[PDB]
Design a protein around this ligand. Structure first.
Ligand SMILES: CO[C@H]1CC[C@H](n2c([C@@H]3CCCC(=O)N3c3ccc(F)c(F)c3)nc3cc(-c4c(C)noc4C)ccc32)CC1
Ligand code: NI
Ligand code: NI
Ligand code: NI
Ligand code: NI
Ligand code: NI
Ligand code: NI
Length: 112
């Protein structure tokens, strides 16, 4: 896997997430527990992940192969499904992003 060519295949699936409005809005920056006043967040969520961090990882070439990228995307989703209640807007928005992601990523993984 050449990093620039891998980035060209993976990045459209990240943009597809960012395009989701409002559903990507809680995911575009790292969760800020001090601003949101949720001091238990880093207790429950051991490994934070968000779209901005995944973008930087993609841009800088830290994904050697596509399943590490998939793994971080799902970590983002999984953190929010763990921390947030099923009835909450963030949780529902998370499920929406995951639905978009599976639609986007499956053709890309098969082409890779
Ligand atoms: C500047 O952009 C705004 C900042 C406030 C944000 N916000 C909000 C605000 C505050 C409360 C009321 C509300 O409805 N919010 C909100 C706002 C926009 C959304 F798209 C959304 F789904 C929820 N709640 C957030 C929750 C989380 C979160 C994630 C992801 N994982 O664990 C937690 C906790 C992250 C952000 C939240 C939503 C986007
Ligand atoms: Ni593009
Ligand atoms: Ni939408
Ligand atoms: Ni390499
Ligand atoms: Ni993982
Ligand atoms: Ni598409
Ligand atoms: Ni699938």
């Amino acid at each position: 896997f050449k990093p620039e060519e891998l980035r060209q295949a993976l990045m459209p699936t990240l943009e597809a997430l960012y395009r989701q409005d409002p559903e990507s809005l809680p995911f575009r920056q790292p969760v800020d527990p001090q601003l949101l006043g949720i001091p238990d967040y880093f207790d429950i969520v051991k490994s934070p992940m968000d779209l901005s961090t995944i973008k930087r990882k993609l841009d800088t070439g830290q994904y050697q192969e596509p399943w590490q990228y998939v793994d971080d995307i799902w970590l983002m989703f999984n953190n929010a499904w763990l921390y947030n209640r099923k009835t909450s807007r963030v949780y529902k928005y998370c499920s929406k992003l995951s639905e978009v992601f599976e639609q986007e990523i499956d053709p890309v993984m098969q082409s890779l």
